[PDB]
Amino acid sequence: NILGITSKKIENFSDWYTQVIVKSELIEYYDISGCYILRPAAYYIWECVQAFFNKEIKKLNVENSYFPLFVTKNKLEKEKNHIEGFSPEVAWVTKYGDSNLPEEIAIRPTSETIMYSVFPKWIRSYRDLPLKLNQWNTVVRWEFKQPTPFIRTREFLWQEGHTAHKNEEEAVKLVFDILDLYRRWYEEYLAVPIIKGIKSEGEKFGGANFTSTAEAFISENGRAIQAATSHYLGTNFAKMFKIEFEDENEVKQYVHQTSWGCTTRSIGIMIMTHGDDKGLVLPPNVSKYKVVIVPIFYKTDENAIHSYCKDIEKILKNAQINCVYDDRASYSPGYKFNHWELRGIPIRIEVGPKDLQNNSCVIVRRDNNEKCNVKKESVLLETQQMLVDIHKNLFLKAKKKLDDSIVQVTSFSEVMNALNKKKMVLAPWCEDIATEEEIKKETQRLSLTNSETTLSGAMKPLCIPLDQPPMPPNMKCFWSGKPAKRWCLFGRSY
Numbered sequence: 113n114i115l116g117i118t119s120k121k122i123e124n125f126s127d128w129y130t131q132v133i134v135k136s137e138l139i140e141y142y143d144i145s146g147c148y149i150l151r152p153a154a155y156y157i158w159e160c161v162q163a164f165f166n167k168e169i170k171k172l173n174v175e176n177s178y179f180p181l182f183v184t185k186n187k188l189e190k191e192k193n194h195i196e197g198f199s200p201e202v203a204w205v206t207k208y209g210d211s212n213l214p215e216e217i218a219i220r221p222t223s224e225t226i227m228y229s230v231f232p233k234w235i236r237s238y239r240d241l242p243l244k245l246n247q248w249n250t251v252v253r254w255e256f257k258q259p260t261p262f263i264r265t266r267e268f269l270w271q272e273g274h275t276a277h278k279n280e281e282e283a284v285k286l287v288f289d290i291l292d293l294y295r296r297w298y299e300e301y302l303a304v305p306i307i308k309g310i311k312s313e314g315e316k317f318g319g320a321n322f323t324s325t326a327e328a329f330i331s332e333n334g335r336a337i338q339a340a341t342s343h344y345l346g347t348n349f350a351k352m353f354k355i356e357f358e359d360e361n362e363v364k365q366y367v368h369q370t371s372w373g374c375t376t377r378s379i380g381i382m383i384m385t386h387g388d389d390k391g392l393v394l395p396p397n398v399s400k401y402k403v404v405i406v407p408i409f410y411k412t413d414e415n416a417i418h419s420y421c422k423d424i425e426k427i428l429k430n431a432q433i434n435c436v437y438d439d440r441a442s443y444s445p446g447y448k449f450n451h452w453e454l455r456g457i458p459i460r461i462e463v464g465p466k467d468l469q470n471n472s473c474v475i476v477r478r479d480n481n482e483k484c485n486v487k488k489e490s491v492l493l494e495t496q497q498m499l500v501d502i503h504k505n506l507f508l509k510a511k512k513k514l515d516d517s518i519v520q521v522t523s524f525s526e527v528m529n530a531l532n533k534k535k536m537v538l539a540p541w542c543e544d545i546a547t548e549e550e551i552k553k554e555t556q557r558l559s560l561t562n563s564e565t566t567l568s569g570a571m572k573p574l575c576i577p578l579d580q581p582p583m584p585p586n587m588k589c590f591w592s593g594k595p596a597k598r599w600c601l602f603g604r605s606y
């Protein structure tokens with residue numbers, strides 16, 4: 113009990129989350145606010161999705177690279193909308209030892225300015241295009257909002273991809289190709305559904321022509337959260353960094369650029385999605401151990417149980433299924449059950465005397481706790497199919513919750529009702545940037561219906577979904593009363 117999760121996910125989501133990430137050994141806290149340690153179980157997930165994304169961006173001819181952590185004032189300030197957005201959260205190095213630096217230098221919050229400072233040397237003619245680069249690194253955004261492990265941190269691990277193209281068409285195609293890879297990263301590895309859409313003008317990346325986005329939704333507190341992003345930068349950074357190329361007709365042109373990122377926030381979204389009141393729940397593709405084997409003794413005798421459990425370990429490891437046999441003498445079976453449930457292991461296999469006598473074992477799924485007796489010779493196949501089935505169940509259950517978290521409305525008088533039911537709204541909107549602040553202020557004012565002390569009551573535009581319902585001929589904007597343009601998702605958010 114004391115060693116389990118002692119806050120229910122529905123009753124105290126914030127304390128449940130803290131208990132889950134600590135007791136599963138994902139996260140350790142640190143003496144600098146907003147910075148957290150990724151312990152091995154958390155870093156293993158990152159390596160899994162790193163492996164997947166590398167393999168896929170390789171097919172698009174993107175190549176990994178590594179650029180400096182630091183940027184000079186001269187470079188950092190070249191693109192005005194970019195730096196106006198980041199400048200209050202940029203951390204500056206000013207000293208080495210007790211000596212002042214001759215010039216202060218900034219830590220990257222993102223690397224457009226760093227990388228594009230040298231793109232002009234690499235891109236001189238149409239022969240040099242497309243240029244396609246990625247980095248796996250961390251960046252620093254020194255905000256003073258309340259941090260949350262994985263999802264809102266001052267330093268975070270991510271990849272940032274950056275490409276440059278001879279025209280708009282090719283760059284935009286890559287934007288949406290990357291956006292579908294983020295859909296796959298979340299779906300095939302984290303069993304998380306996302307919504308693709310376009311950011312409103314007030315929410316797009318600074319310096320972007322447009323920002324496409326993958327949005328996730330945390331049903332338990334009614335909060336949307338950006339899962340990944342892929343920007344068409346157009347020629348906006350090419351203008352400011354003078355990234356020009358001579359085209360086939362001997363005319364100077366600006367490159368058309370993209371950048372796109374996805375972070376360890378994805379792990380936090382997975383935890384909040386599938387985690388339950390027993391702790392972490394891992395999709396098998398991001399769990400080091402797919403199976404834990406637990407022995408049960410009453411009280412060859414003890415050697416007979418040990419030999420049998422080791423046989424099952426050999427069967428799984430010979431088939432490339434990593435597993436652990438928990439043969440620790442000092443802890444009860446029920447201790448071990450909780451121990452590994454807490455840590456999110458997908459499958460427990462139990463072996464006691466009655467299972468040995470029947471030449472079977474008990475196979476227990478972490479997601480729904482269903483138990484079944486499997487003969488020894490069918491354990492390999494049953495385990496294989498059950499790992500597939502757990503992932504499918506986690507994803508389908510999550511997708512039903514996401515679907516159920518959207519209410520389509522036509523007037524603002526329906527909005528507050530749905531927000532306080534922890535929903536997002538899909539609403540007809542004129543898309544005028546001026547209305548975004550107005551909507552944020554008024555929904556925050558009317559929220560006077562929240563028990564979160566560190567997240568805003570404001571609802572903001574989340575994304576204009578790529579999948580649009582019909583817009584009836586005279587539908588008005590739900591806020592301004594002007595002709596509505598498209599349907600947009602709004603909600604409270606992280």
Ligand SMILES: O=C(NC1Cc2ccccc2C1)c1nccnc1NC(=O)N1CCCCC1
Pocket residue numbers: 146253254255256257258259260262263264265266267268338339340341373374375376377378
């Ligand atoms: O934005 C993050 N942190 C900042 C916001 C915040 C709030 C409280 C305290 C400190 C900070 C700094 C963030 N933190 C951790 C992991 N991913 C994060 N970001 C993202 O997932 N996205 C989407 C993909 C492109 C980049 C942004």
Ligand code: PRO
Pocket residue numbers: 222223224271272273317341343371372373374
């Ligand atoms: O920070 C962002 O959103 C973009 C995409 C990764 C590179 N910079």
